[PDB]
Amino acid sequence: KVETHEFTAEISQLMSLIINTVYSNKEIFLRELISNASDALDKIRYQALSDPSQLESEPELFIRIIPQKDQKVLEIRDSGIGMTKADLVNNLGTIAKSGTKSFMEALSAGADVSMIGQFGVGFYSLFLVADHVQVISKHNDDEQYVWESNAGGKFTVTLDETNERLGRGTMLRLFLKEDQLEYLEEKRIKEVVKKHSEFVAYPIQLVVTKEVEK
Ligand SMILES: CCc1cc(C(N)=O)ccc1-n1nc(C(C)C)c2c(-n3cnc(-c4cnn(C)c4)c3)ccnc21
Numbered sequence: 585k586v587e588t589h590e591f592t593a594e595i596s597q598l599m600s601l602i603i604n605t606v607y608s609n610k611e612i613f614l615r616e617l618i619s620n621a622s623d624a625l626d627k628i629r630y631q632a633l634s635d636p637s638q639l640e641s642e643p644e645l646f647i648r649i650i651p652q653k654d655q656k657v658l659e660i661r662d663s664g665i666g667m668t669k670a671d672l673v674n675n676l677g678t679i680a681k682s683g684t685k686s687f688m689e690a691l692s693a694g695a696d697v698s699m700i701g702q703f704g705v706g707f708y709s710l711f712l713v714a715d716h717v718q719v720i721s722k723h724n725d726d727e728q729y730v731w732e733s734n735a736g737g738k739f740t741v742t743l744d745e746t747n748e749r750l751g752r753g754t755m756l757r758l759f760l761k762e763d764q765l766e767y768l769e770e771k772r773i774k775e776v777v778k779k780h781s782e783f784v785a786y787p788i789q790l791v792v793t794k795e796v797e798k
Pocket residue numbers: 589590591592595617620621622624662664665666667672673674676677678679680681704705706707708719731753754
């Protein structure tokens with residue numbers, strides 16, 4: 585049911601550096617997350633070329649941004665390849681450890697947080713704008729799971745029994761910091777997407793909730 589795992593010391597050091605930094609251009613968080621989405625989609629598209637049945641869990645390949653102002657949550661969804669529990673618990677653990685080691689060495693050499701994506705750990709840039717994250721992911725040949733963390737030193741992995749079935753892929757839910765609620769506004773998201781994501785081979789859809797003036 586609910587597994588709990590501790591973050592390595594170094595990974596907690598990096599996650600705390602990110603949340604607490606006052607780096608000026610925090611919008612890069614969304615280029616990093618879209619980038620991870622485009623990659624996950626590149627993976628399933630290629631695998632399906634020689635095995636078209638890998639797509640019958642979700643035929644369309646897309647990226648979808650859903651602000652939820654009531655909940656103060658910014659949602660980022662794709663139909664990419666998704667992630668197994670083994671990816672969530674162990675296999676991205678070792679990718680996260682190595683990428684964090686390299687990324688810290690770069691920072692200690694005057695490198696920038698906006699370079700985080702070259703180290704395979706772009707996902708952690710969400711703490712520029714969010715203090716908590718839930719990751720819902722569904723891989724073909726595995727069940728749907730929810731990975732959860734608050735930048736501390738623990739994260740959980742839970743068999744997913746409460747959300748809409750995804751079909752295939754990944755949804756991220758960023759619980760925005762109280763001072764970063766601009767990233768719920770449609771105009772801003774359009775701003776950031778068109779400045780830092782010109783070259784993405786998949787649709788980026790925006791799901792805007794507006795009251796009707798009657
Ligand atoms: C590149 C994989 C990916 C794809 C998409 C997509 N398809 O859109 C979205 C996000 C991510 N990412 N990227 C990461 C890290 C590796 C940078 C990550 C993650 N994770 C974070 N830390 C641990 C961790 C530390 N220690 N251990 C034992 C486990 C695991 C948990 C869930 N999704 C993660």
